[PDB]
Amino acid sequence: RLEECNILFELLTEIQDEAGSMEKIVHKTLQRLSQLLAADRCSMFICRSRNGIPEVATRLLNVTPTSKFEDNLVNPDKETVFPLDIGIAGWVAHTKKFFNIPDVKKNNHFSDYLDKKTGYTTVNMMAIPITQGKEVLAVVMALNKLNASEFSKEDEEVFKKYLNFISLVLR
Amino acid sequence: RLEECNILFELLTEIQDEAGSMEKIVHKTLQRLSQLLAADRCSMFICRSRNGIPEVATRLLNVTPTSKFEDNLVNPDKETVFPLDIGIAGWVAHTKKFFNIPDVKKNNHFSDYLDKKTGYTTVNMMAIPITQGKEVLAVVMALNKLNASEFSKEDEEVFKKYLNFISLVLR
Amino acid sequence: RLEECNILFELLTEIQDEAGSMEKIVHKTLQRLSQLLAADRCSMFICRSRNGIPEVATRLLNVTPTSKFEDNLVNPDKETVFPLDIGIAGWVAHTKKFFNIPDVKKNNHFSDYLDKKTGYTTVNMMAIPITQGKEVLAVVMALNKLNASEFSKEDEEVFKKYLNFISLVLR
Amino acid sequence: RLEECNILFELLTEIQDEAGSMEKIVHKTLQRLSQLLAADRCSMFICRSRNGIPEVATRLLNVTPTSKFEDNLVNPDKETVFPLDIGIAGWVAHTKKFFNIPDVKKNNHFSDYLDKKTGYTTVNMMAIPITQGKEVLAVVMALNKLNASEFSKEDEEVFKKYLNFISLVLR
Ligand SMILES: Nc1nc2c(ncn2[C@@H]2O[C@@H]3COP(=O)(O)O[C@H]3[C@H]2O)c(=O)[nH]1
Numbered sequence: 106r107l108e109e110c111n112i113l114f115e116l117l118t119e120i121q122d123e124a125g126s127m128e129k130i131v132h133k134t135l136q137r138l139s140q141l142l143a144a145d146r147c148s149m150f151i152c153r154s155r156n157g158i159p160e161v162a163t164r165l166l167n168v169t170p171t172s173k174f175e176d177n178l179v180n181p182d183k184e185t186v187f188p189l190d191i192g193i194a195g196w197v198a199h200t201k202k203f204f205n206i207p208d209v210k211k212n213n214h215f216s217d218y219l220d221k222k223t224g225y226t227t228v229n230m231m232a233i234p235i236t237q238g239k240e241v242l243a244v245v246m247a248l249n250k251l252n253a254s255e256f257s258k259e260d261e262e263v264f265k266k267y268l269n270f271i272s273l274v275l276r
Numbered sequence: 277r278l279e280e281c282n283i284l285f286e287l288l289t290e291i292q293d294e295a296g297s298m299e300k301i302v303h304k305t306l307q308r309l310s311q312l313l314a315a316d317r318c319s320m321f322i323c324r325s326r327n328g329i330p331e332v333a334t335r336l337l338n339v340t341p342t343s344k345f346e347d348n349l350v351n352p353d354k355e356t357v358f359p360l361d362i363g364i365a366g367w368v369a370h371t372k373k374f375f376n377i378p379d380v381k382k383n384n385h386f387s388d389y390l391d392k393k394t395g396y397t398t399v400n401m402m403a404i405p406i407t408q409g410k411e412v413l414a415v416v417m418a419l420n421k422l423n424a425s426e427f428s429k430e431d432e433e434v435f436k437k438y439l440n441f442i443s444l445v446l447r
Numbered sequence: 448r449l450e451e452c453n454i455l456f457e458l459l460t461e462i463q464d465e466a467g468s469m470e471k472i473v474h475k476t477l478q479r480l481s482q483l484l485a486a487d488r489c490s491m492f493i494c495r496s497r498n499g500i501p502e503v504a505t506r507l508l509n510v511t512p513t514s515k516f517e518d519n520l521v522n523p524d525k526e527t528v529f530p531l532d533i534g535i536a537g538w539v540a541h542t543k544k545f546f547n548i549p550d551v552k553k554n555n556h557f558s559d560y561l562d563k564k565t566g567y568t569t570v571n572m573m574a575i576p577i578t579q580g581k582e583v584l585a586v587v588m589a590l591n592k593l594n595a596s597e598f599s600k601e602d603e604e605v606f607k608k609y610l611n612f613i614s615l616v617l618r
Numbered sequence: 619r620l621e622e623c624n625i626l627f628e629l630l631t632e633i634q635d636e637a638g639s640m641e642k643i644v645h646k647t648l649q650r651l652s653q654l655l656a657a658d659r660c661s662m663f664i665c666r667s668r669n670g671i672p673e674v675a676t677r678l679l680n681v682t683p684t685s686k687f688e689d690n691l692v693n694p695d696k697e698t699v700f701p702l703d704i705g706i707a708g709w710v711a712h713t714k715k716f717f718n719i720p721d722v723k724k725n726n727h728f729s730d731y732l733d734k735k736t737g738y739t740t741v742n743m744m745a746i747p748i749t750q751g752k753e754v755l756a757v758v759m760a761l762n763k764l765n766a767s768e769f770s771k772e773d774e775e776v777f778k779k780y781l782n783f784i785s786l787v788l789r
C-alpha cells in the first residue's frame with residue numbers, strides 16, 4: 106500500500122515509452138499532496154508549443170484527497186489554454202519561478218477566466234513549474250488553504266518535497 | 277536483525293565527542309526512522325514535572341533525513357509546554373500508551389496550537405511514550421506518512437523496533 | 448518490501464528539479480546503502496569506450512550518509528581512467544560478474560593506484576556491474592565494512608536489492 | 619556477526635554499572651580500526667588523577683586485527699604512567715586536541731621511554747583524546763602506518779569515525 110506508488114511507477118517506467126499515462130501517478134501523488142497541504146484543490150497544467158508558440162493548458166483539475174482520476178482528467182475535448190502573459194499559471198511557466206500567492210487579485214498576473222467559467226473562487230495559490238532542463242513540461246498548483254488565510258512557509262517545503270517527485274515522474 | 281545493526285552502528289560513528297550527544301543520537305535515529313517509514317518528519321517532546329504536576333514540552337521538531345540538529349533542537353526559552361490534558365502528546369504521556377492515529381481531525385485530544393503557531397498541517401501520526409519505571413521521560417512521534425493515507429500496522433512494528441533503542445539511549 | 452519502498456520514495460523527494468538529477472539519485476541511493484550495509488563508503492565508476500576500447504573511470508567517490516554530492520562528483524578533468532585489465536573495478540566490467548572481496552591484498556586484479564593517489568586504504572569490497580544488454584554502463588562498490596571483518600552473504604542480498612533500482616535509474 | 623559489536627554493547631549497557639569491562643568492546647573496536655587504517659598497532663591509554671595529580675597510563679597495547687584481548691590488556695601489575703608534560707600521549711590529554719604526527723622525534727612532546735623498554739620503534743602516530751565534557755577519560759592512538767610514510771588525511775577521517783563510537787562506549 107505504501108509501495109503502491111512505486112509498483113505503478115516501476116510499471117510505467119520499464120515499458121519504456123510513456124504512452125500509458127504518467128498522469129495516473131501524478132494524480133495519485135496530487136491526492137496525497139492535498140491531504141497534507143489541506144488545499145481545497147490541486148491541479149496540473151500541461152505546457153506546450155502549438156504550433157510554434159508557448160502556452161499553458163489544463164490537464165488535471167479539482168484534485169482532492171479522494172477525487173476519482175476520470176473526474177479530474179480533462180480530455181482535449183474541452184481544455185482551457187493560456188498564453189504565458191495571461192494568467193498566474195502562465196507567469197510561473199514563463200519565469201520558471203516558484204510562487205506562494207496569499208491573495209490573488211492583489212497579484213497582477215492573476216487571470217479569472219476559469220473562476221468565471223466554472224463557478225470556483227480562487228483566493229490562495231502555491232504554484233511551481235516542472236522543468237526538464239531547457240523547457241517547462243508542466244505547472245502544478247495548490248489552491249485555497251483550508252482552516253487558514255494563506256499557505257504557510259511549512260506548506261511550501263511540503264509542496265516542494267512532493268514536486269521533486271512529481272518532477273521526476275514527468276520524465 | 278541485520279540492517280538495524282548496521283544503521284545504528286553507522287549512525288553512532290557520526291556523533292561528535294561533544295554535547296548533548298545523547299540527544300544528537302536520538303535525533304539521528306529519528307532521521308533514520310523518517311527514511312524507513314517515509315514519514316514527513318519526526319519529533320520529540322520531553323516530559324518533566326513541577327511539584328508533582330507533569331507537563332510535555334517541545335524539544336526536537338522537524339527531524340528529517342536532511343535536517344540539522346541545531347535547527348531541530350528547540351530553544352529552551354521558546355519551548356511550547358502542554359499540560360497532559362491537552363494534546364495527543366500529553367495524552368500519550370498520561371496513558372503511557374502507543375497510538376497510531378490515522379486522522380488527527382477525528383481524534384479529540386488533538387490540540388491544534390502548534391499547527392497555528394508553526395503553520396504546519398498535521399494529518400496523521402504515530403506516538404509512543406518513552407518510560408522509566410512508572411514515570412515518562414519523553415514522547416516521540418512520526419508525523420505525516422508521505423506515500424499512503426496513514427501509517428501501516430507494519431510501520432508500527434518498525435517504529436516500535438527503533439524506539440527500544442531510543443529508550444535505552446534516553447537513560 | 449516495506450522499508451525499501453519508503454527509503455526509495457523519500458529519497459526521491461529530496462532530489463531538486465535540476466541536473467544531472469539521475470546521478471544525484473544514484474548518489475542518494477548509495478548514501479542509503481552505506482547506512483544499511485555499515486559500509487565506510489560507496490563509489491561508482493562510469494564505464495565507456497573509445498573506438499571499441501572500453502575503460503572505467505572515477506565518477507562518484509566517498510559517498511557516505513553525510514556526504515555532499517558536489518564533493519563526491521568527480522571533476523571530468525581530474526578523473527582516473529583504467530583499462531579493464533587493471534583493477535577489480537575493470538575486472539567487474541570485463542566479466543560482468545558480482546564480487547564480494549573480503550581482502551583486496553589477496554585478490555590479484557586489485558590495483559592500488561587510487562589508494563596511492565587519494566591516500567585511502569581499501570580493505571574489502573563488494574562490486575557489481577550495471578549493464579544494458581551486452582554492454583556495461585557502470586561499476587558500483589561498497590568499500591570497507593565497518594562492523595565486521597568483511598561484507599556478509601546477507602549484505603550481498605541487500606546491495607543486490609538496491610542495485611536493481613540504480614540499474615533502472617541508470618537508463 | 620555484524621551485530622556482535624551491538625549485542626555486546628547492549629549487553630554491557632543494560633547491566634547499568636560498568637563493572638564488566640567496556641574494554642572488551644574498545645578492544646574489538648580497536649581491532650577493526652587497525653585493519654582499515656593499516657596501522658601496525660593501536661593502543662588505549664587510561665587517563666586518571668592519582669591522587670590529585672593528572673596522568674596518562676597504559677591500558678590496551680599492541681592491538682592488531684587479530685591480537686587476543688588478554689595479550690593486549692595490561693593489568694595494574696605492570697603499567698606505564700606519564701605526567702601530561704612527559705610524552706606525546708600526555709600532550710593530547712592536556713591540550714584535548716587531535717594529532718596526526720608524521721614523524722615523531724621531530725615532535726618535541728614525544729617520549730621514548732616505552733620504545734626503549736619494549737623494543738618497539740614509534741615513527742608515525744595519530745592520537746586523539748576521548749573527553750566526557752570537562753575531563754579526558756582516555757587517549758587512543760594508531761602507530762606506524764604500513765605500506766606508507768605517514769597516516770593520510772583519509773586515515774584521519776576513518777580514525778575520527780571509529781573514535782566517535784569508542785568515545786560513547788567509555789560512558
Ligand atoms: N476550478 C479550478 N480552477 C483552477 C484549478 N487550478 C487552477 N485553477 C484556476 O485557473 C486559473 C488559471 O489562471 P491563473 O490566473 O493562474 O489562476 C488559475 C486558477 O484560478 C482547479 O483545479 N480548479
Ligand SMILES: Nc1nc2c(ncn2[C@@H]2O[C@@H]3COP(=O)(O)O[C@H]3[C@H]2O)c(=O)[nH]1
Nearest residue numbers: 319337338363364365386387390396398
Ligand atoms: N510543526 C511541527 N509540529 C509538530 C511536530 N511534532 C508534533 N507537532 C505538533 O505538536 C502537537 C502537540 O499536540 P498534539 O495534539 O499531540 O499534536 C502535535 C502536533 O500537531 C513537528 O515536528 N513539527
Ligand SMILES: Nc1nc2c(ncn2[C@@H]2O[C@@H]3COP(=O)(O)O[C@H]3[C@H]2O)c(=O)[nH]1
Nearest residue numbers: 490508509534535536557558561567569
Ligand atoms: N578513496 C577511494 N577509493 C576508491 C573508492 N571506490 C573505489 N576506490 C578504489 O579505486 C580502485 C580501482 O581499482 P580496484 O582494484 O577496483 O580498487 C578500487 C578502490 O581501491 C572511493 O570511494 N574512495
Ligand SMILES: Nc1nc2c(ncn2[C@@H]2O[C@@H]3COP(=O)(O)O[C@H]3[C@H]2O)c(=O)[nH]1
Nearest residue numbers: 661679680705706707728729732738740
Ligand atoms: N609498543 C607500543 N608502544 C606504544 C603503544 N602505544 C603507544 N606507544 C608508545 O608509548 C609512548 C607514550 O608516550 P608518547 O611520547 O606519546 O609515544 C608513545 C608511543 O611511542 C603500543 O601499543 N605499543
